Amino acid sequence: FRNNYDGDTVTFSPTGRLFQVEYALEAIKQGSVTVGLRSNTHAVLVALKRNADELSSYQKKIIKCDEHMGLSLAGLAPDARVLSNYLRQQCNYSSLVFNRKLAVERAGHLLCDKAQKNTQSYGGRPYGVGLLIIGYDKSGAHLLEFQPSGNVTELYGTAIGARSQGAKTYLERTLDTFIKIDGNPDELIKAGVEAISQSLRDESLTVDNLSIAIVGKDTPFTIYDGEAVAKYI
Amino acid sequence: TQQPIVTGTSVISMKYDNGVIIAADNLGSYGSLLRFNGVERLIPVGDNTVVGISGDISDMQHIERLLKDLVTENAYDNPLADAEEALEPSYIFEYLATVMYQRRSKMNPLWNAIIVAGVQSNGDQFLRYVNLLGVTYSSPTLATGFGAHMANPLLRKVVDRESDIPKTTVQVAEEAIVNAMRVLYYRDARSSRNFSLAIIDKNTGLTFKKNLQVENMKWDFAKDIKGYGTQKI
Secondary structure (H helix, E strand, C coil), X not given: CHHHHCCCCCCCCCCCCCHHHHHHHHHHHCCCCEEEEECCCEEEEEEECCCCCCCCCCCCCEEEEECCEEEEEEECXXXXXXXXXXXXXHHHHHHHHHCCCCCHHHHHHHHHHHHHHCCCCCCCCCCCEEEEEEEEECXXXXXXXXXXXXXXXXXXXXXXXCCHHHHHHHHHHHHHHHCCCCCCHHHHHXXXXXXXXXXXXXXXXXXXXXXXXXXXXXXXXXXXXXXXXXXXX | CCCCCEEECCEEEEEECCEEEEEEECCEEECCEEEECCCCCEEXXXXXXXXXXXXXXXXXXXXXXXXXXXXXHHHCCCCCCCCCCCCCHHHHHHHHHHHHHHHHHCCCCCCEXXXXXXXXXXXXXEEEXXXXXXXXXXXXXXXXXXXXXXXXXXXXXXXXXXXXXXXXCHHHHHHHHHHHHHHHHHHCCCCCCEEEEEEEECCCEEEEEEEEECCCCCCHHHHHCCCCCCCCC
16 A cells, blocks of 8 residues: 555555655644734734753744745754745845845745645655745735645634644634734734644743744834743743 | 847936826937838836837847736736736836846847836836946936937926926926927937827826827028028028
C-alpha cells in the first residue's frame, strides 16, 4: 500500500492523494502555534515560540518581508527562511522596478506557485512549513494562510500549528468583534493574544514565549518580542 | 549599437493646477523626408496616463507593445484592476525608466526620449522624463528634442516655479501648449502641422484631442521681404 505511493511527490495514490504533500502538512501540525487576525485597519500576528531545553532561546516565528508585509511560520524553519526570502525578493522587485508596494493578494499568488513547483516534479520535496501572512496595501489590511500544498487563502483571522483548532474557534466566534477594532492597535493584539491563549496547555504565555507582529494604516510592519509584550499577558 | 531611422520630433508638456497636458505632432520622418503623416506619438495607458515618445519609431512601436502588455498582465488575478490596483503613472514611468537604463547598459538602447504625463490616484500631477540613456528628471514643464530649446522657454513664462502651478488653469495651459506647437512648426524643419494633445485632469479625467492643426499663423509680412540685403525689388 503506502511505501509504494509515498516515496516521491510525483506519485499520485489510487485515490488521487499526494502523500509527500500530506506528510509535509504534518510537520506544520507539530510546530508551535501562531495566530493571525485583522480588523479593517491593522493585522496582527501572535505566535507562541518553542524552546528545546530551558537553557535555550525560543526560535523566532515572525519574519518581516517589507515595511508593509510579514509572516509567522509553523513547521520546518529553514523552509520558512527559503520562502520568506523569496517574498522579500519579490517585494523588492516591485518597489525597484515599478515603485509599487506588492499586494498581499499578489504575494499569496506567488507563494502558491513556488510551492506547487515542488509538488509536481521528481527528486524534490514539498516545503514543510506553513505561513500566516499579514500586510497593509492599497486595499487595506490582509491576512493570508499559506499551506505547502500550494493553497493560499485570505481570511479575517486564523491559526496554524499544534492545537491550532483552539484559537481557530475563538476567532471564529469573536469575528463580529475584532473585525471592528479599528483605530485601536493594542485591542487587536489583545484579541489575538486571547485567541492564541485558547490553544495553550503546557504552560502560560510568558515574556520569553510570546511574539506579536502588527502592520496597518500608519504602522509599518513591526515585531514585538520579549520585553515589549509584557503589557499583553 | 544602433542608429535611428524613422523618427518623431518634440513632445512637450507642462503641469497645471488640476492636471497635465502633453502634445506631440503626428510625423515620422526618414531623415529629411517627412515620410509618414499619420503617426500617433501619444500613448494613453488606462485612463490616467499618457506617454509621449520622440525618437526612433520602430522603438516607440516596441514601447507601445510593452505598455499594452503591462495592462494585460496587471489585470491578471487582480480583482481590483479597474480600481485600487490599476496602473499609476509612477508605475508606468518607473517601469520604462528601468527598461531604458537596462538597454543602455547593454549598449543597445531604445533610441527615444519619453515623457510620462499623468495624475496619481490621490490627485497629484505626475510629469517625468526618461531618455535613451536612462536619465530622468521632473519639472513643471518638460519637452524633448527641439522643444526643449523653444517650447520650454515659452511654457516656463507661464509656470516658472512650483508655486505657479496652482495659479494656472487648463485654458491657460492649453493655450500655451498650442502656441509652442505653432512656434515649433515655424522653426523645426522636422515638424508637422498636424498634432495630438492630451489633458489628464483629476476631475474630468482623460481628454484626448486628435487631428489638431496649427492655426492663426503669421506669414503675411513675408510679402515685404526681398533679396538678402540690397535688392530693392
